[PDB]
Amino acid sequence: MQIFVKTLTGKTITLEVEPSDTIENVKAKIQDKEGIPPDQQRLIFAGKQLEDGRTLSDYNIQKESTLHLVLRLRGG
Amino acid sequence: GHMFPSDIDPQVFYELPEAVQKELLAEWKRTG
């Protein structure tokens, strides 16, 4: 499937994943598309924030669905 | 203040939840 990660600049990067794909691996595809390391990058969906150990399905996201990408400076 | 790197723009940053914006602007300002 595919999902549309809107970046914070007003961009939308579509990426191809599974509902069972984890947020960590989604952010790693953002690193492929945008260049941002996952530990430094955050993910929102529908005015809520996601965690690396969760999945699109955990947030009930499906195909052709939109996400939000922020920069969060650091993590470790 | 509604951006820091070129990766940020007020429109999406307003669609954004306030508490995550709070993290962002405060940290952006701090590392700034």
From Swiss-Prot, chain A:
Site (Essential for function): H68
Subcellular location: Cytoplasm; Nucleus
Residues modified to Phosphoserine: S65
Variant or mutagenesis effect after changing K63R: Abolishes HLTF-mediated polyubiquitination of PCNA
Resulting phenotype, R74G: No effect on ADP-ribosylation
PTM description: Phosphorylated at Ser-65 by PINK1 during mitophagy. Phosphorylated ubiquitin specifically binds and activates parkin (PRKN), triggering mitophagy. Phosphorylation does not affect E1-mediated E2 charging of ubiquitin but affects discharging of E2 enzymes to form polyubiquitin chains. It also affects deubiquitination by deubiquitinase enzymes such as USP30.
Superkingdom field: Eukaryota
Domain Ubiquitin-like: 1-76
Per UniProt, location of the Glycyl lysine isopeptide (Gly-Lys) (interchain with K-? in acceptor proteins) cross-link in this chain: G76
Positions where (Microbial infection) ADP-ribosylthreonine occurs in the chain: T66
Residues marked Interacts with activating enzyme (site): R54, R72
Effect of G76A: Loss of ADP-ribosylation
PTM-bearing positions, type ADP-ribosylglycine: G76
Position(s), cross-link Glycyl lysine isopeptide (Lys-Gly) (interchain with G-Cter in ubiquitin): K6, K11, K27, K29, K33, K48, K63
Protein's job: Exists either covalently attached to another protein, or free (unanchored). When covalently bound, it is conjugated to target proteins via an isopeptide bond either as a monomer (monoubiquitin), a polymer linked via different Lys residues of the ubiquitin (polyubiquitin chains) or a linear polymer linked via the initiator Met of the ubiquitin (linear polyubiquitin chains).
Protein name, entry field: Ubiquitin
Organism expressing this protein natively: Homo sapiens (Human)
Upper classification of the organism: Eukaryota, Metazoa, Chordata, Craniata, Vertebrata
Swiss-Prot record, chain B:
Record PTM text: Monoubiquitinated. Protein monoubiquitination prevents POLI binding to ubiquitin via the ubiquitin-binding motif 1 and ubiquitin-binding motif 2.
Ubiquitin-binding 2 (UBM2) (motif): residue ranges: 8-25
Distribution of this protein across tissues and organs: Ubiquitous. Highly expressed in testis.
Domain of life: Eukaryota
Subcellular location: Nucleus
Entry's free-text remark on domains: The catalytic core consists of fingers, palm and thumb subdomains, but the fingers and thumb subdomains are much smaller than in high-fidelity polymerases; residues from five sequence motifs of the Y-family cluster around an active site cleft that can accommodate DNA and nucleotide substrates with relaxed geometric constraints, with consequently higher rates of misincorporation and low processivity.
Subunit and partners: Interacts with POLH. Interacts with REV1. Interacts with ubiquitin.
The protein's role, per its UniProt record: Error-prone DNA polymerase specifically involved in DNA repair. Plays an important role in translesion synthesis, where the normal high-fidelity DNA polymerases cannot proceed and DNA synthesis stalls. Favors Hoogsteen base-pairing in the active site. Inserts the correct base with high-fidelity opposite an adenosine template. Exhibits low fidelity and efficiency opposite a thymidine template, where it will preferentially insert guanosine. May play a role in hypermutation of immunoglobulin genes. Forms a Schiff base with 5'-deoxyribose phosphate at abasic sites, but may not have lyase activity.
Sequence similarity: Belongs to the DNA polymerase type-Y family.
Name of the protein: DNA polymerase iota
Source organism: Homo sapiens (Human)
Lineage: Eukaryota, Metazoa, Chordata, Craniata, Vertebrata
Name of the gene: POLI
Residues of the full protein shown: 704 to 732 of 740
